[PDB]
Amino acid sequence: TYNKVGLYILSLAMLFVFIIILTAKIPLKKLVLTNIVPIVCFVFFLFSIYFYNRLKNITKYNGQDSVKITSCQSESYESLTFLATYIVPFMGFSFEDMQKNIAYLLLVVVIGIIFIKTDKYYANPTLALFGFKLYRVNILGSGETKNLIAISNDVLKVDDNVYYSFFDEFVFIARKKI
Amino acid sequence: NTYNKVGLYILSLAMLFVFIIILTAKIPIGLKKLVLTNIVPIVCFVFFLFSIYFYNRLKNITKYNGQDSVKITSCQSESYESLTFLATYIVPFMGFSFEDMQKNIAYLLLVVVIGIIFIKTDKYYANPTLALFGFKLYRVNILHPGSGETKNLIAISNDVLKVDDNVYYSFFDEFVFIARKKI
Amino acid sequence: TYNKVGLYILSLAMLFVFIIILTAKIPIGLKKLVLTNIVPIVCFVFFLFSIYFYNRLKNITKYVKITSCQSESYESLTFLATYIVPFMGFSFEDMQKNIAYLLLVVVIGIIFIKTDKYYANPTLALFGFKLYRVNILHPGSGETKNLIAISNDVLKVDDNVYYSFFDEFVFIARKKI
Amino acid sequence: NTYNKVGLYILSLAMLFVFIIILTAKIPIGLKKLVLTNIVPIVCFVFFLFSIYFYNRLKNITKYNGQDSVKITSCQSESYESLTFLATYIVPFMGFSFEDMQKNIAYLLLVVVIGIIFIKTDKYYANPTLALFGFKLYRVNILHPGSGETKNLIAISNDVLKVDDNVYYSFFDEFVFIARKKI
Numbered sequence: 076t077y078n079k080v081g082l083y084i085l086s087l088a089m090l091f092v093f094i095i096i097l098t099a100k101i102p103l104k105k106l107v108l109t110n111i112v113p114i115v116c117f118v119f120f121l122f123s124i125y126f127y128n129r130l131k132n133i134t135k136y137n138g139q140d141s142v143k144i145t146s147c148q149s150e151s152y153e154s155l156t157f158l159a160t161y162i163v164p165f166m167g168f169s170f171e172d173m174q175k176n177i178a179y180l181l182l183v184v185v186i187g188i189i190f191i192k193t194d195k196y197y198a199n200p201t202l203a204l205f206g207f208k209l210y211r212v213n214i215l216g217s218g219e220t221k222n223l224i225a226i227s228n229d230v231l232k233v234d235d236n237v238y239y240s241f242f243d244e245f246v247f248i249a250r251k252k253i
Numbered sequence: 254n255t256y257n258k259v260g261l262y263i264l265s266l267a268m269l270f271v272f273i274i275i276l277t278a279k280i281p282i283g284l285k286k287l288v289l290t291n292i293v294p295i296v297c298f299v300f301f302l303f304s305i306y307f308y309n310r311l312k313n314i315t316k317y318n319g320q321d322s323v324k325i326t327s328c329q330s331e332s333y334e335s336l337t338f339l340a341t342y343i344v345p346f347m348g349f350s351f352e353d354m355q356k357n358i359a360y361l362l363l364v365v366v367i368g369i370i371f372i373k374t375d376k377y378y379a380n381p382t383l384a385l386f387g388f389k390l391y392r393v394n395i396l397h398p399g400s401g402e403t404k405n406l407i408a409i410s411n412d413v414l415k416v417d418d419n420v421y422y423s424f425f426d427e428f429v430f431i432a433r434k435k436i
Numbered sequence: 437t438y439n440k441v442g443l444y445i446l447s448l449a450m451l452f453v454f455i456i457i458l459t460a461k462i463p464i465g466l467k468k469l470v471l472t473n474i475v476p477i478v479c480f481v482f483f484l485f486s487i488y489f490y491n492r493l494k495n496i497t498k499y500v501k502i503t504s505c506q507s508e509s510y511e512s513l514t515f516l517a518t519y520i521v522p523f524m525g526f527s528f529e530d531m532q533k534n535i536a537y538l539l540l541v542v543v544i545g546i547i548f549i550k551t552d553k554y555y556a557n558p559t560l561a562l563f564g565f566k567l568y569r570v571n572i573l574h575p576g577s578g579e580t581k582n583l584i585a586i587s588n589d590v591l592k593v594d595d596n597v598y599y600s601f602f603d604e605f606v607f608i609a610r611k612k613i
Numbered sequence: 614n615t616y617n618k619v620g621l622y623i624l625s626l627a628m629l630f631v632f633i634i635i636l637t638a639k640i641p642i643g644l645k646k647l648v649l650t651n652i653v654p655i656v657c658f659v660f661f662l663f664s665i666y667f668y669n670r671l672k673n674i675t676k677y678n679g680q681d682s683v684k685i686t687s688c689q690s691e692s693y694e695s696l697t698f699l700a701t702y703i704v705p706f707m708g709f710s711f712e713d714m715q716k717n718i719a720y721l722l723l724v725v726v727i728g729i730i731f732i733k734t735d736k737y738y739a740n741p742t743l744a745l746f747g748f749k750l751y752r753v754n755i756l757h758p759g760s761g762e763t764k765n766l767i768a769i770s771n772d773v774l775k776v777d778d779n780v781y782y783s784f785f786d787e788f789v790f791i792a793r794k795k796i
């Protein structure tokens with residue numbers, strides 16, 4: 076599953092637009108040699124667009140059905156991920172001096188280690204602009220399935236057809252068939 | 254009615270505008286020069302009159318000529334998340350230097366992006382600066398007499414909501430509304 | 437009982453030591469040297485006021501049965517409100533920054549603490565103070581409930597202490613041998 | 614036993630020393646005045662070597678053998694108090710450009726006073742930087758085969774603790790200890 080790093084690029088997906096705005100020493104290969112982080116962020120933005128297309132067409136396949144939807148509930152977001160991965164790199168990447176961005180980019184490592192769990196890096200509140208929503212679904216053929224938090228592009232009513240992909244053993248992708 | 258939805262968010266960020274005009278302004282007549290070196294203070298002042306306008310709108314929205322008297326069955330205090338304060342107000346006090354307009358453009362884009370996120374994830378009342386203007390969250394259950402029943406609605410009002418007293422309503426979405434006490 | 441400002445000044449006692457170290461600009465000394473550092477003069481006057489309030493709070497209680505006794509679990513949010521943010525604001529070399537940080541002190545005053553439990557700053561624990569939750573029973577009708585004590589010493593069930601009532605929720609007491 | 618307590622607190626304040634060393638360090642035969650010019654990274658390097666010395670000391674407090682075996686009756690998770698991260702780490706990140714030694718002396722007094730409250734109020738293990746070195750809190754009801762039974766003690770350990778397994782006690786106060794898994 077190489078798409079696991081695809082969601083994390085799609086998790087940020089708009090911070091790379093901010094670094095283009097923030098660090099841009101525009102007035103030739105000299106201008107290419109003066110700023111490098113804009114080029115890296117542009118490559119990552121293009122990769123984010125490609126992973127968005129892959130996540131868009133990744134649910135359309137020949138997989139012969141998952142389940143009818145059983146009892147489920149909403150999840151909502153964790154704002155600590157948005158304070159960790161989005162505000163602090165934004166403050167790191169605008170200070171100049173070459174010596175403060177290293178400190179703030181180590182602070183984001185410290186917050187990512189000690190304040191949030193390893194598996195809960197997919198619950199980014201930035202991943203709400205692209206029509207995404209999580210529902211915790213108890214899937215019950217397929218078999219018994221519990222504690223599987225599903226990424227969905229629409230609402231999830233009960234007792235209806237749904238196609239599935241798989242992302243991890245905690246998370247997966249679902250699309251509603253009518 | 255999503256126009257007032259972004260308006261609650263822009264009302265809950267007026268003290269940020271006050272912090273910006275306090276932190277930024279360079280007051281020593283002058284006409285063009287005083288306008289030119291202070292563009293961020295007058296922009297945040299325009300945003301401040303926008304927030305005052307939306308305060309006037311949120312005060313006047315309740316008397317909508319409906320005269321409804323929906324009663325209260327269960328009510329309990331919700332409180333704010335108290336991280337939405339840290340998500341919008343930690344920015345100008347972490348050392349952000351308002352020197353070039355590129356950084357101010359990036360900051361305004363961050364405010365717009367965080368507003369779109371907070372609108373879409375149903376966290377536009379979660380900012381704890383809403384209690385500064387006076388607004389208390391109550392998880393309340395209205396009766397809606399004679400035409401059905403609702404469940405698990407979040408109400409914002411500037412007065413105390415006890416149990417079993419009829420109120421008005423002014424809905425934002427299907428989940429969030431605003432009441433005031435009948436007198 | 438105006439002594440609520442007595443405990444508030446004693447709560448910020450070690451803060452005024454910081455501002456003396458921080459914002460003083462002492463290098464021949466004239467009256468001008470006194471008049472530039474007006475803020476250290478006010479902080480020193482408040483420090484002597486805190487010394488007086490320490491000497492007064494040493495013997496406020498002058499000349500009962502205790503039922504419940506639980507720990508209080510000191511809140512750190514009052515420490516983030518009134519201690520580290522004025523220390524941030526008071527060293528920035530221009531007036532607008534401390535004005536802004538004092539305004540944020542006001543904001544993380546009213547909008548966060550819901551200030552009736554402002555007494556529980558952990559700087560008081562430096563000055564030999566401990567907090568306990570108590571229900572009082574006495575032949576003074578014992579009617580007060582959900583009472584919280586601030587003391588220099590530990591308490592337990594049925595401990596003879598002298599009440600020195602402070603507010604609706606607060607008193608000061610020590611045990612009797 | 615307060616020496617081990619302030620050792621645990623100064624082990625918690627380790628990435629702050631690393632952050633100060635990163636944040637203020639002047640990168641520019643006779644070049645021997647660099648110790649005089651760069652005094653803050655030198656004293657923070659001395660502090661960092663001290664912090665790793667208390668870490669190496671705390672790694673083998675439980676190595677002291679006395680044939681210790683006590684049976685754990687219950688286990689939970691307490692988790693670090695999230696607010697105490699902001700009380701010791703917000704100083705070099707909410708501004709505070711390092712300057713003449715008056716401000717550094719004030720910051721040293723603030724760190725010392727922070728330690729003086731945090732020892733007295735029993736919130737030295739509450740710092741969440743301790744999980745970076747690897748430490749998981751477990752509220753344990755532990756029964757001693759001996760004089761009596763103890764209740765509601767907070768345990769710090771480098772291993773995961775299950776139900777009914779034996780540990781080694783290294784009591785700081787009567788409330789906390791650092792333990793290792795029986796093997």
Ligand SMILES: CCCCCCCCCCC(CCCCCCCCCC)(CO[C@@H]1O[C@H](CO)[C@@H](O[C@H]2O[C@H](CO)[C@@H](O)[C@H](O)[C@H]2O)[C@H](O)[C@H]1O)CO[C@@H]1O[C@H](CO)[C@@H](O[C@H]2O[C@H](CO)[C@@H](O)[C@H](O)[C@H]2O)[C@H](O)[C@H]1O
Pocket residue numbers: 153154155158186334335336338339342343513516544694695696699702703706
């Ligand atoms: C401008 C400068 C000053 C501003 C200060 C303003 C206040 C800021 C404090 C904010 C803050 C931590 C933020 C940490 C900093 C983040 C990195 C910082 C980066 C910069 C370097 C602490 O907030 C405080 O936390 C205390 C302990 O949590 C709590 O006390 C309590 O004591 C008793 C229990 O011991 C108890 O009995 C008592 O009832 C309480 O009261 C306090 O009431 C509360 O105010 C809030 O964090 C909280 O905890 C989580 C995260 O850990 C996180 O939510 C999680 O849990 C939810 C439960 O449902 C769940 O719903 C969420 O899904 C989940 O995710 C949220 O964030 C927030 O819920």
